[PDB]
Design a protein around this ligand. Structure first.
Ligand code: NDP
Ligand code: NDP
Ligand code: CB3
Ligand code: CB3
Ligand code: K9A
Ligand code: K9A
Ligand code: UMP
Ligand code: UMP
Lengths: 510, 510
């Protein structure tokens, strides 16, 4: 009696154009559709109910949908029209035609009470709209396509449609990890209409034996749940400490996350991440550049507060020009151990080029276990505006030419920095994979002092009420031009299908 | 349906002079109470021998909320009537002439009143119960230290759970506890001879999918299961690769373990770990010593194969004397960045003493987030006999003056090195805690390239068939004398209650 809806949908609720699908073929989505509509426990089949145009949109070879009772809602098509279109295969059910959705559901009760198990409404907008109006839909199986495409047909507005993009309810109980086919990111959600072996162990367990992110979500496949759960874990279980800043901190020690890079890109969705910032900083690092004015001048001000006259003096660096971070990250990457003078100097050929070494080892001997890059130079710390937070990274290639990367971070501002750090090293992994002819597989985040500032806790709690959106894809453009790590520009990247929730203001502790 | 509850030394010792052999173990008593009390209006019964009844302090006898039965021919029910004032709600103590009689009485006069029957000592009752074959389960507290005893729990098939020599197999192994300088743990042996319905179909298509360590053990509380499961995980899921050595490897990337240091010490038990080796190497590191002959001369040969004329030449270090590891681990700890000459040189005051800095920061500003030590100096790598494996560690103090330590290891020989590395940095944590007036809490192991050599897999599979024993305690002796990190000697340590399985020979891949 209670129907399910099954649908794939752009963020703007688009489902169709020109009586076809808006996107190229999404293989995994089709598998899912088939598997959800066919699978059943009994001589009980499922029924699929569809509109006339949806029936017409389907290629002849696939229609009628096999092993499923097909019902078409139409006032023009007759059952004989359909029977005449293609010969009924033995064992399959003869396609029914009904005048409306109510009629289709009556027919299912009247003529098929003992025959059908589940009822699926499978489009188009006519049927989705009616089903929601009648209030007979218990569950929505929604494939969220993260890219927008030209569409002329749309899934109707519904309470809970904030799962799709920014503006009885339908709340998500299931959010998968991000898939991709043909350069299209997407994921799967399910919404629900809302409004004496063990007996011997038991007594010993008994004596031996709160903030949660979107707790209604039971299957937490989306990899962003690692970040969301880490926020909750620190707030619930962390310890309140003082620190350098004078601001409060709640901290934990020794934390881990890992993000797939093969299908999509972990640009967190639960608040907008400053992508221009990640890209510009990483290119700056790669250059060995220590002049934060080069960032500031492009609208990336992340380093400004730590390179003021004031902050440099608090660090006993009176001789530093404003903007000079000293021998920080990129300097140690490209010139480890070289004698620093200032940000204006040519250091070409001084010290160890760790990045070159890593790349050359990846290209020639990828089973080597010493493919590390470090920014932590105890001899140079006092000369830096700030000791590095992300201080070491290690590369690994498997049997399939898949590249993984670990980064160790001594100090993790979970609220502000962590999302930015995830994106930064995930991007570096993409860039290195490309230049070494490898496939990016995984970014692995190892975290030391993992903390949330006290002045962030109330904003972070709001963030935890948001369900994640599918991750976008990052494409490297102009691959043919790009042969070395130094070749990348700010323009050779495309972020595809990024649909985050709004910015949340969070003040940087200087 | 009877269960035995007992605490026992590795040699099966239970008693001396009609008392317990050990000082009071608080957690064991909690456990005993909780197991025997926890349950309708149905109580548990405890059955005990006369001497056991006499051994118990009057304040605790009879055992509250439990039907007490004493097995004796000399003692009388009436004696207990007037021995002590009887509370309402509690059951009158019964006396029976034998264990068979106690069990008959339970059937005859307490058919439905009682749930579980517990035999609670002493050797008279344990022996009878095992002879009758009426015991289904053993609740055994394994005391890891040996004590003078005159009374022993009987030999039983499966008593190899206690020390090295119808069956009793362990189904439960807890983590290691300690009270009054006594390590112990808890085992249980068993006598042998539509929210989810909507999610279901989507989960089914998403999973399109075997070594296990002592699989009969269902509750896997012992922290050594992290190591055992990591072995299994690599063998099951790892990828076969070549490597530097020419030997096969099966590898994974990005692995984690963490070990409590507050109660006991993670010296793995499933094979004997070379403790003299860990202690001597760590002291050597702390000295800044780079002469492996100093280790070799004490019977610690771990560095010999990597400091031969042959190996040094394969590394293009002809000018190195045999035994000179170059500017490796301890050199970088105590003298980061100093110009190396040879192992005979005084480097006092050259480079950065990272260990001193960490300790001074712990003693003066323990909320600082830069308490790191690194051995990874890209400028010096080519001069080293071997690039360091354990390359970075970070310290952390919470609000309770508890010290935790993270160590990052780029390359992990799971078979040979890992157990040794766990012990090494856990020990360093103890030493640092003491000298900084802190309480050791936790060692956290972060692992990069995590591998098992192919020529170890056969031996590792044997290792996985062994149940872990309780972890020992490591005590620092002569605490009063020891005020700085340099003060420790090879003699200021005591390892208490270590009862590992036998050595397993595993060749070092050179
Ligand atoms: N991305 C996705 O998940 C999905 C994509 N699609 C796309 O959607 C499009 C087709 O959907 P759409 O254009 O909305 O057409 P529909 O599938 O809704 O079919 C429209 C026709 O069906 C009949 N009908 C529908 N609703 C009613 C109603 N309430 N009462 C009576 N008759 C009704 C009428 O047939 P008649 O006029 O003969 O009486 C009507 O003209 C295509 O582009 C297709 O590719 C389809 C399914 C899902
Ligand atoms: N570590 C642990 O977990 C525990 C250890 N203990 C220790 O054990 C010691 C006492 O144990 P133990 O010396 O064996 O004494 P018991 O407590 O077993 O009592 C022995 C007496 O019980 C009676 N009895 C024993 N066996 C039988 C039998 N098969 N049939 C009939 N009557 C029997 C006899 O008294 P009678 O002649 O009157 O019948 C015998 O002298 C103490 O040191 C105590 O601290 C005790 C509890 C648990
Ligand atoms: C990490 C790192 C590099 N850094 C450097 C940097 C320097 C000092 C720091 N200090 C503290 N206390 N926390 C930090 O995260 C931090 C980060 C950054 C600094 C600022 C922003 C920032 O202003 N954030 C963006 C939004 C980014 C996001 O969504 O997370 C903004 O517009 O505010 C980002 C990165
Ligand atoms: C890590 C580390 C220290 N080290 C240093 C060290 C040096 C080179 C290495 N090389 C390789 N390939 N694997 C290693 O584990 C390794 C370890 C060790 C070296 C040897 C032994 C050894 O031959 N067996 C020990 C058993 C110790 C144990 O139980 O783990 C013995 O008793 O001889 C142990 C530790
Ligand atoms: C190239 C191509 N074009 C179309 C199809 C195809 C085959 C069978 C059915 C369909 N439909 C397209 C829309 N459908 C659908 C697809 N995906 C979800 N999640 N829900 C749906 N209702 C079911 C109907 C499309 C397969 N391959
Ligand atoms: C100082 C002190 N001395 C003795 C006791 C005490 C109190 C009640 C009972 C006992 N027993 C000691 C040994 N017992 C026991 C203890 N622990 C386990 N695991 N099994 C057991 N059977 C039960 C008998 C000991 C408590 N406190
Ligand atoms: O890439 C970065 C740079 C900085 N920080 C944060 C961590 C701390 O909150 C702060 C630096 O303070 P200390 O860890 O140096 O005390 O900046 C990050 O999280 N990531
Ligand atoms: O403390 C140590 C030192 C060495 N190794 C092992 C790891 C590797 O098997 C080998 C080092 O060889 P490379 O990682 O340099 O290839 O020694 C350890 O596990 N722990």
């Amino acid at each position: 009696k209670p129907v399910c809806l099954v649908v794939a949908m752009t963020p703007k609720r688009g489902i169709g154009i020109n009586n076809g699908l808006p996107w190229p073929h999404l293989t995994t989505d089709f598998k899912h559709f088939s598997r959800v509509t066919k699978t059943t426990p009994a001589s009980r089949f499922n029924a699929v109910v569809m509109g006339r145009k949806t029936w017409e949109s389907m290629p002849r070879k696939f229609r009628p949908l096999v092993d499923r009772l097909n019902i078409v809602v139409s006032s023009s098509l007759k059952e004989e029209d359909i029977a005449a279109e293609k010969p009924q295969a033995e064992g399959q059910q003869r396609v029914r035609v009904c005048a409306s959705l109510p009629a289709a559901l009556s027919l299912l009760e009247e003529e098929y009470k003992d025959s059908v198990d589940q009822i699926f409404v499978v489009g188009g907008a006519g049927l989705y709209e009616a089903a929601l109006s009648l209030g007979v839909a218990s569950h929505l199986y929604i494939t969220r396509v993260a890219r927008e495409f030209p569409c002329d047909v749309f899934f109707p507005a519904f309470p809970g449609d904030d799962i799709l993009s920014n503006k009885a309810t339908y709340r998500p109980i299931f959010i998968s990890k991000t898939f991709s086919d043909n350069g299209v990111p997407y994921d799967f959600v399910v919404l629900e209409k809302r409004r004496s072996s063990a007996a011997a162990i038991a007594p010993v367990l008994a004596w031996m034996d709160l903030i949660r992110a979107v707790p209604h979500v039971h299957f937490r496949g989306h990899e962003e749940f690692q970040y969301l759960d880490l926020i909750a874990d620190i707030i619930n279980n962390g310890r309140t400490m003082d620190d350098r800043t004078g601001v409060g901190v709640i901290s934990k020690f020794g934390c881990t996350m890992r993000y797939s890079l093969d299908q999509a890109f972990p640009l967190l969705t639960t608040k907008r991440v400053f992508w221009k910032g990640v890209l510009e900083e990483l290119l700056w690092f790669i250059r060995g550049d220590t002049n934060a004015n080069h960032l500031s001048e492009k609208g990336v001000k992340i380093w400004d507060k730590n390179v003021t006259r004031e902050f440099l003096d608090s660090r006993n660096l009176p001789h530093r020009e404003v903007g000079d971070i000293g021998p920080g990250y990129g300097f140690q990457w490209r010139h480890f151990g070289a004698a620093y003078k200032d940000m204006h100097t040519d250091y070409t050929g001084q010290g160890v080029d760790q990045l070159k070494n890593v790349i050359q080892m990846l290209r020639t001997n990828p089973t080597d276990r010493r493919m590390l890059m470090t920014a932590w130079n105890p001899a140079a710390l006092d000369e830096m505006a700030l000791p590095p937070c992300h201080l070491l990274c290690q590369f690994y290639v498997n049997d399939q030419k898949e590249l993984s990367c670990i980064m160790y971070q001594r100090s993790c501002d979970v609220g502000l920095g962590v999302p930015f750090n995830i994106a930064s090293y995930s991007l570096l992994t993409l860039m290195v994979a490309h230049v070494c002819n490898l496939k990016p597989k995984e970014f692995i985040h190892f975290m030391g002092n993992t903390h949330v500032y006290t002045n962030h806790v109330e904003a972070l709690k709001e963030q935890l009420r948001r369900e994640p959106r599918p991750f976008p894809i990052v494409n490297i453009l102009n691959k043919e031009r790009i042969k070395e790590i130094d070749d990348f520009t700010a323009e050779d990247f495309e972020v595809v299908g990024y649909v985050p929730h709004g910015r949340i203001q969070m003040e940087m502790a200087v």
